[PDB]
Amino acid sequence: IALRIQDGVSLALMAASTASTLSGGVDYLTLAWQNGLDNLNGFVPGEILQATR
Amino acid sequence: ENQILTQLYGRGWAFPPVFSLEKGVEMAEGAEDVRQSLQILFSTEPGERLMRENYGCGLNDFMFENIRNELIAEIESHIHDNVLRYEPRADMTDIQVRQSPGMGNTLQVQVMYRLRGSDINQQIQGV
Amino acid sequence: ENQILTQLYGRGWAFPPVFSLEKGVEMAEGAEDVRQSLQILFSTEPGERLMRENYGCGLNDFMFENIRNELIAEIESHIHDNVLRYEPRADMTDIQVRQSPGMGNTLQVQVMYRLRGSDINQQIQGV
Amino acid sequence: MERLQPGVTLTESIITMGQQEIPSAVPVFIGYTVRYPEQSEASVRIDSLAEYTSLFGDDHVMMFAVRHYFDNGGQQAFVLPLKDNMPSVEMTTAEAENLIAALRSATVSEAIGGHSQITLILVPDMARLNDSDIVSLWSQGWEALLQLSQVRPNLFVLLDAPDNVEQAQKCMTTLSSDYRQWGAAYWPRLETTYQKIFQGTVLSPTAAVAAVIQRTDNDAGVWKAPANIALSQVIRPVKSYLQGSVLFNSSGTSLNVIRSFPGKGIRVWGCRTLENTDNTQWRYLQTRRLVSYVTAHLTQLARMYVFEPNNELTWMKLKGQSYNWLRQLWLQGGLYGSQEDEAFNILLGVNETMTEDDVRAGKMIMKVELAVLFPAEFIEISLVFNTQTEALS
Amino acid sequence: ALFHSVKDDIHFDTLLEQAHQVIEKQAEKLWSDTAEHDPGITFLQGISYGVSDLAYRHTLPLKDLLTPAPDEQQQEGIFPAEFGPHNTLTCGPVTADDYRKALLDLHSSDSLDGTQQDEGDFLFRSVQLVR
């Protein structure tokens, strides 16, 4: 999955939206590890995240 | 305003979180925790709690829709199964939804609730 | 025109196979591989691939037949279950088949598709 | 790949989508274009962006409003271009007057008032003067726009508010037009996902709201309020939501705000016209658009028997056909009544509405009164405790 | 790869279970309602997510933690170029044997001038230093 962030949804909130179409969503740590996040809140709202399983 | 109802519902922080120099943080005791536990739920909307993603009454997703008997019956259904999930200590007993006589746009909901396990009136207002 | 969509769909050779002196063969990247993977399928007819015998859209086996509402509904059925077999990365979302206003014999099909797993618009045209 | 021989040859030309033709919600985009090639007509109808870019040029501020209008779900629109030159990167004060003087001109007032298909107008080029314009220049543009919606019956105007909060409160108070109920102002500029995701282009908000006005007209009719519906291609409002909490006034003029809900998208929040509530009935946007929907559909019934003998017969054919339509609108949930004499009423007789000279002058007088609904914008919980009335089984 | 072994431990669900056990032992009488409504837990859930945020930054790989920001860098990488194995393992020429290792190295292109930098063998085919 590729996801477009929008304005102050957290990583804890965005990793719950992956569970709609990923058969049990990715954890908010393992979502941050796959994208190579420097921080848990280190995403700009324009950035595209990727959620593989 | 007794110590018995504290043993059924516990002590927690009051929702206006005002801190005092004596006794620390103001504690909401037993019969008043369950009222304030309903005031927290109606005041937050789902998604803005940090990790508990679906916590809070979503009355925001149906407003700016016209007042009819089908919107009113959707509020009483939504406000009933939401207190069942996020309030185990308060059982609802009646919902009255009606639009106010003064201003026609606003409509006022009134939730009547009893506490579980106990039929003890509150003597007067307080905390 | 980012590196993220390459990770979902991969890099492949562009269907106009034009070779350059720098960077070798021109590579069709992630969002543009899936468009060109549809351009290869509509452009080949089944039987003229070498060992993959049944690969390609057979729109040749129903042409020179008269334009009616029964031919149009047979194109939208054929063009739907063919993209399902030979294009796993692009999901179809609408087919519009109509005959052109200028020349009455030719009819123009329009396939609207989204890519799977991603809702990311393309910014402007290119590659 | 033989393109002249008969076969299956793929082309790059984009053909049009099957239009649904929503009749009661269709916008004009009156702005500066770079090409201006159309030589037959005044204002032309576009259907897609790829049809627009061939027909009005590329890379301007009015294109990104059309491109964002076709992303949120709008399917047909008109474009009336201004004939003057396209402005600079920033708008100079000598040039920003040339736009508002072209909005008061009869060259753009005759194209709108002559076409009679458009139901709401909007300028996406008013947010171009949001930088380096200098406060009253915004109000000189709003008073031009609300006057432009007076040329013919069914017209509305969606209009841009200034991003600066002091400038917004001043232009709300110092407007002073007598036609304020035909407008609606949506405050923040949207940062869409078009280049120059890192620096998305800042955009007028009204191009997205005209698509969701058209989108809520398709399913829930004109009587439904266009607020609380998600916007497609936007990242964020460029101003914070908490900075604009003084824009809503329940007693004064209230300005519609675009909110960002976490987990729920970017949403329109508020359906209010520009209005100072001294017992006004056209307070909400949906009330002004419903009452102008029943004028523009009772004129289509009353046009059918102009030049008729004006006896007692052709009134009962008018009192019968309009009663049968208003009841058909009332039974769709449109008019706030428990019975039909509570929802609406019409009167037409020779001793009720008209005099004996008005029959001799040749006029019919029909008096349509109709009730409307309220949008439920505030909700108040009460939370009372009720073991008092359990009443010992 | 410190992240994959600690991944179950630096977590909101397991740091919160640590935090409830401090409350349930020490303040079980005065603070008896730890449900998801009260302001006491929501302050704690804000903090125990901030600690899970803070402890995630420790599990980044050590080459990416130790690099500074690109505005301020000493010229070569993580350890300075004086600290490479060419200077940390090698010792000075003190023996007659590594006098021979050093004198055998000298070469015509190492000269600062002359002979158009292409000609030349090493300067000495053998040397012998002795008392």
Side-chain angles (χ1 to χ4, degrees), chain B residues 9-15 27 33 37 40 49-52 55 89, chain E residues 12-13 16 30-33 36-40 42-43 45-46 49:
Chain B
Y9 308 120
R11 281 166 101 253
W13 295 37
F15 163 66
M27 275 282 156
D33 193 43
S37 187
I40 299 154
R49 281 284 300 262
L50 191 40
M51 200 87 201
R52 309 297 177 246
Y55 181 79
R89 283 166 301 139
Chain E
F12 186 89
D13 292 2
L16 205 56
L30 292 183
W31 191 2
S32 178
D33 165 65
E36 285 169 58
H37 70 90
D38 61 334
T42 66
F43 295 163
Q45 287 180 6
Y49 184 84

mmCIF file of all heavy atoms in Angstrom, chain B residues 9-15 27 33 37 40 49-52 55 89, chain E residues 12-13 16 30-33 36-40 42-43 45-46 49:
data_model
loop_
_atom_site.group_PDB
_atom_site.id
_atom_site.type_symbol
_atom_site.label_atom_id
_atom_site.label_comp_id
_atom_site.label_asym_id
_atom_site.label_seq_id
_atom_site.Cartn_x
_atom_site.Cartn_y
_atom_site.Cartn_z
ATOM 1 N N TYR B 9 -17.296 2.611 42.074
ATOM 2 C CA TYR B 9 -16.874 3.250 40.839
ATOM 3 C C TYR B 9 -15.463 3.817 40.868
ATOM 4 O O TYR B 9 -14.927 4.132 39.803
ATOM 5 C CB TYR B 9 -17.864 4.359 40.468
ATOM 6 C CG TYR B 9 -19.270 3.841 40.465
ATOM 7 C CD1 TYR B 9 -20.234 4.380 41.294
ATOM 8 C CD2 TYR B 9 -19.621 2.778 39.656
ATOM 9 C CE1 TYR B 9 -21.519 3.885 41.297
ATOM 10 C CE2 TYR B 9 -20.893 2.279 39.653
ATOM 11 C CZ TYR B 9 -21.836 2.834 40.472
ATOM 12 O OH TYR B 9 -23.102 2.320 40.466
ATOM 13 N N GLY B 10 -14.845 3.951 42.032
ATOM 14 C CA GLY B 10 -13.462 4.364 42.109
ATOM 15 C C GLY B 10 -13.294 5.867 42.064
ATOM 16 O O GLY B 10 -14.219 6.631 41.800
ATOM 17 N N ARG B 11 -12.069 6.296 42.336
ATOM 18 C CA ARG B 11 -11.695 7.700 42.292
ATOM 19 C C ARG B 11 -10.851 7.942 41.054
ATOM 20 O O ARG B 11 -9.990 7.127 40.718
ATOM 21 C CB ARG B 11 -10.924 8.106 43.545
ATOM 22 C CG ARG B 11 -11.787 8.346 44.750
ATOM 23 C CD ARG B 11 -10.947 8.406 45.997
ATOM 24 N NE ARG B 11 -10.702 9.772 46.438
ATOM 25 C CZ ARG B 11 -9.534 10.392 46.324
ATOM 26 N NH1 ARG B 11 -8.507 9.768 45.772
ATOM 27 N NH2 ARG B 11 -9.392 11.632 46.765
ATOM 28 N N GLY B 12 -11.103 9.056 40.377
ATOM 29 C CA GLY B 12 -10.317 9.452 39.232
ATOM 30 C C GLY B 12 -10.170 10.960 39.186
ATOM 31 O O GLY B 12 -10.760 11.684 39.989
ATOM 32 N N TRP B 13 -9.371 11.410 38.230
ATOM 33 C CA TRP B 13 -9.123 12.831 38.077
ATOM 34 C C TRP B 13 -10.377 13.509 37.550
ATOM 35 O O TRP B 13 -11.093 12.961 36.710
ATOM 36 C CB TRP B 13 -7.960 13.089 37.118
ATOM 37 C CG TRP B 13 -6.593 12.613 37.553
ATOM 38 C CD1 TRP B 13 -6.291 11.479 38.234
ATOM 39 C CD2 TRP B 13 -5.346 13.266 37.300
ATOM 40 N NE1 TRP B 13 -4.943 11.387 38.436
ATOM 41 C CE2 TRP B 13 -4.339 12.474 37.869
ATOM 42 C CE3 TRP B 13 -4.987 14.446 36.650
ATOM 43 C CZ2 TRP B 13 -3.000 12.821 37.812
ATOM 44 C CZ3 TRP B 13 -3.660 14.788 36.596
ATOM 45 C CH2 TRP B 13 -2.681 13.979 37.170
ATOM 46 N N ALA B 14 -10.660 14.696 38.070
ATOM 47 C CA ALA B 14 -11.784 15.465 37.566
ATOM 48 C C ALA B 14 -11.463 15.998 36.177
ATOM 49 O O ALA B 14 -10.309 16.296 35.865
ATOM 50 C CB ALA B 14 -12.115 16.614 38.512
ATOM 51 N N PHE B 15 -12.497 16.106 35.332
ATOM 52 C CA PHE B 15 -12.242 16.430 33.928
ATOM 53 C C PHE B 15 -11.816 17.879 33.722
ATOM 54 O O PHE B 15 -10.922 18.115 32.893
ATOM 55 C CB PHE B 15 -13.440 16.041 33.054
ATOM 56 C CG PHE B 15 -13.435 16.697 31.702
ATOM 57 C CD1 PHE B 15 -12.452 16.398 30.767
ATOM 58 C CD2 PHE B 15 -14.408 17.617 31.368
ATOM 59 C CE1 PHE B 15 -12.442 17.006 29.537
ATOM 60 C CE2 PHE B 15 -14.405 18.225 30.133
ATOM 61 C CZ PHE B 15 -13.421 17.917 29.217
ATOM 62 N N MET B 27 -10.012 15.119 42.953
ATOM 63 C CA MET B 27 -10.412 13.766 42.611
ATOM 64 C C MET B 27 -11.922 13.683 42.460
ATOM 65 O O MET B 27 -12.664 14.135 43.337
ATOM 66 C CB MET B 27 -9.942 12.793 43.685
ATOM 67 C CG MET B 27 -8.529 12.324 43.484
ATOM 68 S SD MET B 27 -8.456 11.073 42.209
ATOM 69 C CE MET B 27 -6.773 11.244 41.688
ATOM 70 N N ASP B 33 -17.653 10.433 39.390
ATOM 71 C CA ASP B 33 -16.783 9.985 38.311
ATOM 72 C C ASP B 33 -17.598 9.548 37.111
ATOM 73 O O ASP B 33 -17.224 9.840 35.974
ATOM 74 C CB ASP B 33 -15.884 8.844 38.774
ATOM 75 C CG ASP B 33 -14.765 8.558 37.801
ATOM 76 O OD1 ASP B 33 -14.151 9.517 37.298
ATOM 77 O OD2 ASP B 33 -14.493 7.371 37.541
ATOM 78 N N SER B 37 -17.362 10.900 33.552
ATOM 79 C CA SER B 37 -16.923 9.977 32.512
ATOM 80 C C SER B 37 -17.813 10.054 31.284
ATOM 81 O O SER B 37 -17.403 9.645 30.196
ATOM 82 C CB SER B 37 -16.902 8.553 33.043
ATOM 83 O OG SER B 37 -16.336 7.683 32.095
ATOM 84 N N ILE B 40 -16.579 13.452 29.452
ATOM 85 C CA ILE B 40 -15.364 13.336 28.652
ATOM 86 C C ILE B 40 -15.688 12.729 27.298
ATOM 87 O O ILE B 40 -15.163 13.161 26.266
ATOM 88 C CB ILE B 40 -14.302 12.516 29.403
ATOM 89 C CG1 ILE B 40 -13.941 13.197 30.710
ATOM 90 C CG2 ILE B 40 -13.047 12.393 28.595
ATOM 91 C CD1 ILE B 40 -13.426 12.270 31.757
ATOM 92 N N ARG B 49 -7.922 11.160 20.258
ATOM 93 C CA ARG B 49 -7.139 10.445 21.249
ATOM 94 C C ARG B 49 -5.937 9.811 20.561
ATOM 95 O O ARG B 49 -5.962 9.531 19.361
ATOM 96 C CB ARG B 49 -7.984 9.385 21.945
ATOM 97 C CG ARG B 49 -8.891 9.933 23.014
ATOM 98 C CD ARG B 49 -8.106 10.275 24.255
ATOM 99 N NE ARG B 49 -7.429 9.110 24.805
ATOM 100 C CZ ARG B 49 -7.902 8.394 25.813
ATOM 101 N NH1 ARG B 49 -9.047 8.733 26.374
ATOM 102 N NH2 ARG B 49 -7.233 7.348 26.266
ATOM 103 N N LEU B 50 -4.870 9.591 21.330
ATOM 104 C CA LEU B 50 -3.571 9.326 20.717
ATOM 105 C C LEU B 50 -3.493 7.930 20.118
ATOM 106 O O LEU B 50 -3.329 7.776 18.904
ATOM 107 C CB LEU B 50 -2.460 9.520 21.740
ATOM 108 C CG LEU B 50 -1.032 9.539 21.205
ATOM 109 C CD1 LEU B 50 -0.918 10.305 19.899
ATOM 110 C CD2 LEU B 50 -0.168 10.185 22.239
ATOM 111 N N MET B 51 -3.602 6.900 20.947
ATOM 112 C CA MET B 51 -3.533 5.538 20.452
ATOM 113 C C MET B 51 -4.873 4.829 20.444
ATOM 114 O O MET B 51 -5.073 3.951 19.607
ATOM 115 C CB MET B 51 -2.541 4.718 21.281
ATOM 116 C CG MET B 51 -2.041 3.466 20.599
ATOM 117 S SD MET B 51 -0.610 3.762 19.570
ATOM 118 C CE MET B 51 -0.711 2.331 18.512
ATOM 119 N N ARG B 52 -5.787 5.178 21.339
ATOM 120 C CA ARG B 52 -7.150 4.680 21.272
ATOM 121 C C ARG B 52 -7.834 5.459 20.160
ATOM 122 O O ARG B 52 -8.357 6.548 20.391
ATOM 123 C CB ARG B 52 -7.850 4.845 22.611
ATOM 124 C CG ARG B 52 -7.052 4.284 23.766
ATOM 125 C CD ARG B 52 -6.870 2.794 23.610
ATOM 126 N NE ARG B 52 -6.042 2.230 24.664
ATOM 127 C CZ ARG B 52 -4.846 1.699 24.453
ATOM 128 N NH1 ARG B 52 -4.352 1.657 23.227
ATOM 129 N NH2 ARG B 52 -4.148 1.205 25.463
ATOM 130 N N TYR B 55 -12.334 6.400 19.978
ATOM 131 C CA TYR B 55 -12.893 6.738 21.285
ATOM 132 C C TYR B 55 -13.490 8.135 21.200
ATOM 133 O O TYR B 55 -12.781 9.099 20.908
ATOM 134 C CB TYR B 55 -11.838 6.653 22.380
ATOM 135 C CG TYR B 55 -12.372 6.982 23.750
ATOM 136 C CD1 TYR B 55 -13.082 6.047 24.474
ATOM 137 C CD2 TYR B 55 -12.167 8.227 24.317
ATOM 138 C CE1 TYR B 55 -13.577 6.343 25.721
ATOM 139 C CE2 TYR B 55 -12.657 8.531 25.561
ATOM 140 C CZ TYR B 55 -13.360 7.587 26.257
ATOM 141 O OH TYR B 55 -13.849 7.887 27.503
ATOM 142 N N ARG B 89 -20.219 1.689 33.370
ATOM 143 C CA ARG B 89 -20.741 1.934 34.706
ATOM 144 C C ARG B 89 -22.060 2.679 34.708
ATOM 145 O O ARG B 89 -22.732 2.704 35.740
ATOM 146 C CB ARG B 89 -19.726 2.721 35.534
ATOM 147 C CG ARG B 89 -18.584 1.880 36.046
ATOM 148 C CD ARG B 89 -17.447 2.734 36.557
ATOM 149 N NE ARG B 89 -16.932 3.602 35.514
ATOM 150 C CZ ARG B 89 -16.584 4.865 35.705
ATOM 151 N NH1 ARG B 89 -16.672 5.403 36.907
ATOM 152 N NH2 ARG B 89 -16.131 5.584 34.694
ATOM 153 N N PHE E 12 4.067 1.001 22.809
ATOM 154 C CA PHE E 12 3.045 1.668 23.607
ATOM 155 C C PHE E 12 2.290 0.675 24.475
ATOM 156 O O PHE E 12 1.968 0.973 25.627
ATOM 157 C CB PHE E 12 2.081 2.417 22.693
ATOM 158 C CG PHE E 12 1.065 3.250 23.420
ATOM 159 C CD1 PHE E 12 1.346 4.558 23.747
ATOM 160 C CD2 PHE E 12 -0.187 2.744 23.735
ATOM 161 C CE1 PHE E 12 0.416 5.331 24.398
ATOM 162 C CE2 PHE E 12 -1.109 3.510 24.395
ATOM 163 C CZ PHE E 12 -0.813 4.806 24.717
ATOM 164 N N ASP E 13 2.009 -0.512 23.944
ATOM 165 C CA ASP E 13 1.187 -1.475 24.666
ATOM 166 C C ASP E 13 1.952 -2.101 25.823
ATOM 167 O O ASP E 13 1.351 -2.582 26.787
ATOM 168 C CB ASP E 13 0.690 -2.553 23.706
ATOM 169 C CG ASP E 13 -0.299 -2.018 22.690
ATOM 170 O OD1 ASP E 13 -0.574 -0.802 22.708
ATOM 171 O OD2 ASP E 13 -0.803 -2.818 21.873
ATOM 172 N N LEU E 16 2.792 0.936 28.557
ATOM 173 C CA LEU E 16 1.617 1.291 29.343
ATOM 174 C C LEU E 16 1.349 0.255 30.423
ATOM 175 O O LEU E 16 0.901 0.598 31.519
ATOM 176 C CB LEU E 16 0.401 1.440 28.439
ATOM 177 C CG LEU E 16 -0.698 2.351 28.960
ATOM 178 C CD1 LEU E 16 -0.131 3.714 29.265
ATOM 179 C CD2 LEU E 16 -1.796 2.445 27.931
ATOM 180 N N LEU E 30 -6.083 5.533 46.561
ATOM 181 C CA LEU E 30 -6.490 6.905 46.288
ATOM 182 C C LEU E 30 -6.848 7.100 44.824
ATOM 183 O O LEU E 30 -7.575 8.037 44.479
ATOM 184 C CB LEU E 30 -5.387 7.873 46.704
ATOM 185 C CG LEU E 30 -5.141 7.978 48.205
ATOM 186 C CD1 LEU E 30 -4.084 9.012 48.499
ATOM 187 C CD2 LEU E 30 -6.423 8.319 48.929
ATOM 188 N N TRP E 31 -6.347 6.239 43.947
ATOM 189 C CA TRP E 31 -6.567 6.347 42.506
ATOM 190 C C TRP E 31 -7.019 4.977 42.023
ATOM 191 O O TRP E 31 -6.222 4.188 41.518
ATOM 192 C CB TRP E 31 -5.303 6.805 41.831
ATOM 193 C CG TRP E 31 -5.431 7.211 40.421
ATOM 194 C CD1 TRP E 31 -6.560 7.260 39.677
ATOM 195 C CD2 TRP E 31 -4.370 7.647 39.575
ATOM 196 N NE1 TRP E 31 -6.271 7.691 38.409
ATOM 197 C CE2 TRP E 31 -4.929 7.940 38.325
ATOM 198 C CE3 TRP E 31 -2.998 7.819 39.756
ATOM 199 C CZ2 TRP E 31 -4.166 8.391 37.260
ATOM 200 C CZ3 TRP E 31 -2.245 8.266 38.701
ATOM 201 C CH2 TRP E 31 -2.826 8.548 37.469
ATOM 202 N N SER E 32 -8.312 4.714 42.149
ATOM 203 C CA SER E 32 -8.850 3.382 41.928
ATOM 204 C C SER E 32 -9.526 3.223 40.580
ATOM 205 O O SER E 32 -9.886 2.101 40.217
ATOM 206 C CB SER E 32 -9.841 3.030 43.035
ATOM 207 O OG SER E 32 -10.413 1.759 42.801
ATOM 208 N N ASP E 33 -9.712 4.305 39.837
ATOM 209 C CA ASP E 33 -10.334 4.259 38.522
ATOM 210 C C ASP E 33 -9.275 4.577 37.480
ATOM 211 O O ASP E 33 -8.874 5.736 37.328
ATOM 212 C CB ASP E 33 -11.499 5.239 38.434
ATOM 213 C CG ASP E 33 -11.930 5.499 37.018
ATOM 214 O OD1 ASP E 33 -12.409 4.556 36.363
ATOM 215 O OD2 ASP E 33 -11.779 6.646 36.557
ATOM 216 N N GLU E 36 -10.318 4.277 30.616
ATOM 217 C CA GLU E 36 -9.812 5.095 29.522
ATOM 218 C C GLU E 36 -10.438 6.478 29.465
ATOM 219 O O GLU E 36 -10.199 7.207 28.499
ATOM 220 C CB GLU E 36 -10.025 4.376 28.196
ATOM 221 C CG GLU E 36 -9.044 3.240 27.976
ATOM 222 C CD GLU E 36 -9.421 2.361 26.808
ATOM 223 O OE1 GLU E 36 -9.545 2.885 25.684
ATOM 224 O OE2 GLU E 36 -9.588 1.142 27.014
ATOM 225 N N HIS E 37 -11.221 6.867 30.468
ATOM 226 C CA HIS E 37 -11.892 8.155 30.398
ATOM 227 C C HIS E 37 -11.099 9.250 31.102
ATOM 228 O O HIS E 37 -11.066 10.388 30.626
ATOM 229 C CB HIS E 37 -13.298 8.045 30.978
ATOM 230 C CG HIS E 37 -13.333 7.838 32.458
ATOM 231 N ND1 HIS E 37 -13.381 8.884 33.350
ATOM 232 C CD2 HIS E 37 -13.343 6.708 33.201
ATOM 233 C CE1 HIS E 37 -13.409 8.410 34.582
ATOM 234 N NE2 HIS E 37 -13.384 7.091 34.519
ATOM 235 N N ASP E 38 -10.425 8.925 32.232
ATOM 236 C CA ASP E 38 -10.048 9.981 33.171
ATOM 237 C C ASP E 38 -8.835 10.754 32.663
ATOM 238 O O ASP E 38 -8.072 10.235 31.851
ATOM 239 C CB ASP E 38 -9.753 9.404 34.557
ATOM 240 C CG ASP E 38 -8.619 8.438 34.549
ATOM 241 O OD1 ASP E 38 -8.374 7.833 33.492
ATOM 242 O OD2 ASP E 38 -7.970 8.287 35.600
ATOM 243 N N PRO E 39 -8.658 12.004 33.102
ATOM 244 C CA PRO E 39 -7.484 12.770 32.662
ATOM 245 C C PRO E 39 -6.155 12.237 33.157
ATOM 246 O O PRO E 39 -5.115 12.624 32.621
ATOM 247 C CB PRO E 39 -7.770 14.164 33.225
ATOM 248 C CG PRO E 39 -9.227 14.243 33.236
ATOM 249 C CD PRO E 39 -9.689 12.894 33.657
ATOM 250 N N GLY E 40 -6.147 11.367 34.162
ATOM 251 C CA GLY E 40 -4.884 10.858 34.664
ATOM 252 C C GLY E 40 -4.213 9.903 33.699
ATOM 253 O O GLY E 40 -2.995 9.940 33.521
ATOM 254 N N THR E 42 -4.897 9.703 30.370
ATOM 255 C CA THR E 42 -4.646 10.352 29.087
ATOM 256 C C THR E 42 -3.393 11.215 29.132
ATOM 257 O O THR E 42 -2.802 11.522 28.094
ATOM 258 C CB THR E 42 -5.841 11.198 28.683
ATOM 259 O OG1 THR E 42 -5.983 12.275 29.608
ATOM 260 C CG2 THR E 42 -7.082 10.366 28.724
ATOM 261 N N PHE E 43 -2.970 11.621 30.325
ATOM 262 C CA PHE E 43 -1.700 12.323 30.449
ATOM 263 C C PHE E 43 -0.605 11.280 30.367
ATOM 264 O O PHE E 43 0.443 11.504 29.758
ATOM 265 C CB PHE E 43 -1.588 13.088 31.766
ATOM 266 C CG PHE E 43 -2.560 14.220 31.911
ATOM 267 C CD1 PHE E 43 -2.816 14.755 33.158
ATOM 268 C CD2 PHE E 43 -3.227 14.741 30.820
ATOM 269 C CE1 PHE E 43 -3.717 15.780 33.307
ATOM 270 C CE2 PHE E 43 -4.127 15.765 30.965
ATOM 271 C CZ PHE E 43 -4.373 16.283 32.209
ATOM 272 N N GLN E 45 -0.898 8.304 28.873
ATOM 273 C CA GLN E 45 -0.842 7.761 27.523
ATOM 274 C C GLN E 45 -0.175 8.734 26.564
ATOM 275 O O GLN E 45 0.389 8.322 25.545
ATOM 276 C CB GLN E 45 -2.242 7.406 27.043
ATOM 277 C CG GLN E 45 -2.802 6.173 27.691
ATOM 278 C CD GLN E 45 -4.179 5.850 27.183
ATOM 279 O OE1 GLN E 45 -4.669 6.488 26.255
ATOM 280 N NE2 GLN E 45 -4.811 4.850 27.777
ATOM 281 N N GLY E 46 -0.229 10.028 26.866
ATOM 282 C CA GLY E 46 0.556 10.975 26.099
ATOM 283 C C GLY E 46 2.041 10.826 26.361
ATOM 284 O O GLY E 46 2.859 10.939 25.447
ATOM 285 N N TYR E 49 3.547 7.351 25.088
ATOM 286 C CA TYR E 49 3.795 7.374 23.654
ATOM 287 C C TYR E 49 5.008 8.229 23.329
ATOM 288 O O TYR E 49 5.706 7.982 22.342
ATOM 289 C CB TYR E 49 2.566 7.897 22.928
ATOM 290 C CG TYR E 49 2.648 7.891 21.425
ATOM 291 C CD1 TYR E 49 2.358 6.746 20.706
ATOM 292 C CD2 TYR E 49 2.976 9.040 20.724
ATOM 293 C CE1 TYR E 49 2.411 6.739 19.336
ATOM 294 C CE2 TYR E 49 3.034 9.041 19.350
ATOM 295 C CZ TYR E 49 2.751 7.885 18.664
ATOM 296 O OH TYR E 49 2.807 7.873 17.294
#
